[PDB]
Amino acid sequence: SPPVVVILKDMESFATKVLQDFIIISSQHLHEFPLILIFGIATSPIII
């Protein structure tokens, strides 16, 4: 059973609200299908 990989390139330009919505929705369906996130950050990691 292969997982799914999603790449977010420029999160600085991303609006927050869609980010929190996607995180909260995907949390309740991890059992349905695995999900892993890869973050590419240009600035220091503190920005997260």
Partner 1 sequence: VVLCRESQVSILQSLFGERHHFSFPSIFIYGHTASGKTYVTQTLLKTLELPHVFVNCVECFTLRLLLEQILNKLNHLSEITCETFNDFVRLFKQVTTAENLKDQTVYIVLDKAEYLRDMEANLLPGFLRLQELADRNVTVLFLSEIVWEKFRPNTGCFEPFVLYFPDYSIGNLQKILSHDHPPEYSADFYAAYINILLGVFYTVCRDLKELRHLAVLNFPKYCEPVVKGRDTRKLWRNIEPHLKKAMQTVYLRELPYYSKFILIAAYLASYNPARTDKRFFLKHHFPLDRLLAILYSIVDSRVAPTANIFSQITSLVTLQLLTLVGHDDQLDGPKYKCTVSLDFIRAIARTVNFDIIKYLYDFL
Of 3, 7, 13, 15, which one interacts with partner 1 (CB under 8 A)?
13
CA separation, residue 22 to residues 29, 35, 48 (Å): 11, 11, 15
CB 12 within 8 A of CB 43: yes
Of 1, 12, 31, 36, which one interacts with partner 1 (CB under 8 A)?
12
- With CB under 8 A as the contact rule, which of the stretches 1-9, 17-25, 31-39 interacts with partner 1? 17-25
16 binds partner 1 (CB under 8 A): no
Q: Cα(31)–Cα(29) distance, rounded to whole angstroms?
A: 5
42 binds partner 1 (CB under 8 A): yes
